[PDB]
């Protein structure tokens, strides 16, 4: 197992970057996609960011339409929706993007004002945008699980999503299909699997890898 | 991660053995199924047991029907097939079971003498037997991958096959479905995954666990 780092280096050396399925500049991804609009936790009620009773207070208000400083901006949003007052794309660009109840301000607003949808897409979570065309960047992002999104955001040297290997060289991710990945792992004398969070198979029982959650 | 053994113990304690999907006595399994007829390697040409040129010599003979002491029994089998001489179920019970070219003597023999099929089933590899009825022991065995078969043969305290947890208590395996497994792992504060051989995720890169093959 001491040869492992050297085998992984050999593995990477086997790839022909010119024959990658596609490639994406990390800078282009960062330009187009706020991390806040990638991470799956943004889609959930923001319980780690607010006391629950404040989130509940906002729902009550939005349903009733008739107040701590943790929620100043959510309150501005809520009142605007209640009053039928308009919010320009500039308001969303200035905003924290994520509504305390989960998802974005832009998506909620555009549901009420569908004519403003196109201009507000840049401020919506990838999971809130329409299903992307196959093979596009947004498609790849929409189909990534949490661990893959985290790896991408971390600028990891490599990660797997959905039988695609994403390989980083310089500032560019090159995508290779599962067959190529497996072929090169085989040649390097390597086995691989995808594991979640920091699950390192700390203890093994039979064929089951266990870790603490 | 020091709490891990204690969490696994708690995990096991959560199962109600009386409400298991099914259960199998390990002794019953050993009685019915020779390990040789379970392990997937028995289905492959026996390259670790014979020089390849001896295996090839046998094929030539079986095709021609006209000789080291590593292959004395395979030669007896081959000549019997060529001569149309018969081999009783007692011959197979006395035999090493596995043909050098892979699979069993019994399966090959029964292909030539289909009337003798039923009496020769006990000497055929599980992968050579007809697809078993759903829910039966043979069905579960036929659907196990290599790591699961090895765990079972090892009498492991627990292993997963196909979204079934096999839990050993005393000499009995109790089967629980994936939902129960996940529910109890969740409660114990545990994460789990199935990994092959002794792949322990020795090195992690992005979300990829790497080990030496």
From Swiss-Prot, chains A, B:
Disulfide bonds: 65-82, 201-209
Annotated compartments: Cell inner membrane
Mod. after translation: Autophosphorylated. Contains two disulfide bonds that may play a role in the stability of the protein. However, the disulfide bonds are not absolutely essential, as some activity and growth are detected in the absence of each disulfide bond.
Induction: The Vxr system positively regulates its expression.
Subunit architecture: Homodimer.
Domain notes: Contains a unique periplasmic sensor domain (SD) and lacks a cytoplasmic linker domain between the second transmembrane helix and the dimerization and histidine phosphotransfer (DHp) domain, indicating that this system may utilize a potentially unique signal sensing and transmission mechanism. Detection of the signal via the periplasmic sensor region may induce conformational changes of the dimer and close the transmembrane helices TM1 and TM2 and subsequently the cytoplasmic DHp domains in a scissor-like mechanism, which changes the activation status of kinase domains.
Protein name per UniProt: Sensor histidine kinase VxrA
Gene name for this UniProt entry: vxrA
Positions spanned in the full protein: 38 to 253 of 499
């Amino acid at each position: 197992a001491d040869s492992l780092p050297e085998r992984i280096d050999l593995f990477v050396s086997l790839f022909d970057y010119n024959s990658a399925t596609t490639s994406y500049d990390i800078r282009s991804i960062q330009t187009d996609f706020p991390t806040r609009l990638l991470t799956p936790d943004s889609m959930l009620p923001q319980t780690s960011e607010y006391p629950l009773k404040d989130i509940q207070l906002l729902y009550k208000l939005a349903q009733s339409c008739t107040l701590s400083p943790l929620i100043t901006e959510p309150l501005v949003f809520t009142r605007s929706l209640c009053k039928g007052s308009s919010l320009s794309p500039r308001w969303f660009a200035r905003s924290g993007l994520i509504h305390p109840g989960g998802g974005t301000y832009a998506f909620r607003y555009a549901e009420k004002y569908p004519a403003q949808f196109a201009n507000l897409l840049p401020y919506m979570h990838i999971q809130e945008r329409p299903n992307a065309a196959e093979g596009t960047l947004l498609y790849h992002l929409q189909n990534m699980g949490e661990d893959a999104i985290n790896a991408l955001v971390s600028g990891a040297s490599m990660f797997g999503s959905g039988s695609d290997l994403w390989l980083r060289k310089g500032d560019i991710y090159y995508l290779f299909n599962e067959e190529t990945w497996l072929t090169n792992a085989n040649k390097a004398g390597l086995s691989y699997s995808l594991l979640s969070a920091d699950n390192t198979c700390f203890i093994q029982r039979g064929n089951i890898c266990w870790d603490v959650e």
